[PDB]
Design a protein around this ligand. Sequence first.
Ligand SMILES: [Ag+]
Ligand SMILES: [Ag+]
Ligand SMILES: [Ag+]
Length: 654
Amino acid sequence: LAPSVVTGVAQSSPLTIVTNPKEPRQPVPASDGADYLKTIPGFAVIRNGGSNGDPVLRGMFGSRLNILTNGGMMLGAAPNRMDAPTSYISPETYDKLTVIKGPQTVLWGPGASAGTILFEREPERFGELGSRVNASLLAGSNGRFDKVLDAAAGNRLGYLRFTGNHAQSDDYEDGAGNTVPSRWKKWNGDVAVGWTPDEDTLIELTAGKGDGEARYAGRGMDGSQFKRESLGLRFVKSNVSDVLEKVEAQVYYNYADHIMDNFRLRTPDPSSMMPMPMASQVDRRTLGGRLAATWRWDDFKLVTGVDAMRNEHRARGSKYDMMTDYYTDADQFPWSKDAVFHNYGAFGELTWFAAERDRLIGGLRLDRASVKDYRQTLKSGGHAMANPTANDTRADTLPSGFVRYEHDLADSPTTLYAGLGHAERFPDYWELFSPKRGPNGSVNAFDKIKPEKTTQLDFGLQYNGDKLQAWASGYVGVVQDFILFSYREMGSSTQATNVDARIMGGELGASYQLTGNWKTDASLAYAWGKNSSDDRALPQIPPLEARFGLTYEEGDWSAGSLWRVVAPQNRIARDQGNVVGKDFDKSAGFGVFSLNGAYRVTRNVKLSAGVDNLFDKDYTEHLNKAGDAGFGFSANETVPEPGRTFWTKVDFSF
Ligand SMILES: [Ag+]
Ligand SMILES: [Ag+]
Ligand SMILES: [Ag+]
């Protein structure tokens, strides 16, 4: 044993990473999904404030990542993604985090060109009647405090389960001593009812609520509300037949209700295009379901099924009378619906266990996607505009698939693997509705922006020895009709556009067990992108970074140190980027050092602590948003990362 603090997660199967998100993590995560991804090589995060980052996998942002929770899809509503999908996930309340890199699965939905991320809670198992609880408290610099509870009781026939958290922090300071407008509050509460009549059968109803707020250094407005509401139903029957091994069915309902203003966590900037109190409410309603069957016989295992998904987006805004001074809050007006999306798909995955050391896996899916523009007018400022595609529909049929070959050697515990994958993605809400202009000669983005089609070779290896566990994965790929934002400056209007891209990169890591008490590990992540249409680099691409860890674990306690070293990024595309951010300047390299320890006091209680960024280094990341002028940020000066921070955490388990 010996407890420890997670500083990196290795890749354990080909293309696949699996971690328990309840373990303490050494750059301490701000209780959102993006922060639990940056201990996994290949992930980078766009900082908005102190929480709610936007994840970026192998340089690929946004909906190119398929982020699921218990199989279902949570989508946000902000026109510029202040509430990215991960800003509604609290990883600590889940039991398992899985990443599958590359377009190398078809089981979990459409258009996951960059990868799939699966936060899961696993069903309770009870034999005798009994109960279990595991909780945690964290406390740290800048008023950071986190409560987490996960209790359950039941017997052989069924169970009731509860998971909650509350978490907050004030503004953090950067290395220079400057207070950064960060600071955020988040709470979640979720219940699950489970019924297990016999041991083949399981039915489970889940429901949950969550809310939060966040100040955003890198935005003209702040998130004063992040309301979530969630229901799901799941059926899993095992051993139906001699070949039929599993049948799973699930329905999910996720509702997001975001508010966005410039007066509840800030005062309106008198010197900006926005001196008046302004609020804007937006919501997102996702309904979806999946039905899959797993056949198993001889040397094969086939998984077939279908899925479907609908989601709806509405908005409404406030009003300020300048003639007098009256403010009419946004909830006094009806919701204007503006978009509805539809997807249905059928998919299958075949696996061939070609004896001992040889595995071939192939999969396919066909998707019918479609969208309707419900905007009756457009916004053009307080005065409105005709929307030329009002009530227009458009649709498409998009096939996807992959083959992958896995080979074990006889000599060493080494697996090699190589895989080819193709993935087509329908444009999402932000790609179709958020740009102010479409491609050249279009009426708007909705009318013209084409799907995105990714073809990519993935390859790598695993070495799972005794003293040394190493891994590596590379990727080479082309992207046709990459959806690309370009920015002009009155001031900041975007144009969505399709271009052709080449992409390549990879991750590699190793963790060597020096003695019984000494462990070191290392990792490296590189992404690269070219815009072939305009012959230049792709924008918003994270630079090369390495992580160096060293751990001493005696008995019952451990101490760790971690170095993070990031190269500069000189490959940039000025005024290009996505719906959230844009490149402007080349970034500086930097180094950050941190310390941690853990101590198991009993089989039920364990302690851990750390200091992040010991030397109070004043630094920023290449992908961080530009800090807002109203907070005293000069042009294109991005949001600084936090300076030295201290945290301690206690973990209960009964
Ligand atoms: Ag916003
Ligand atoms: Ag206004
Ligand atoms: Ag505003």
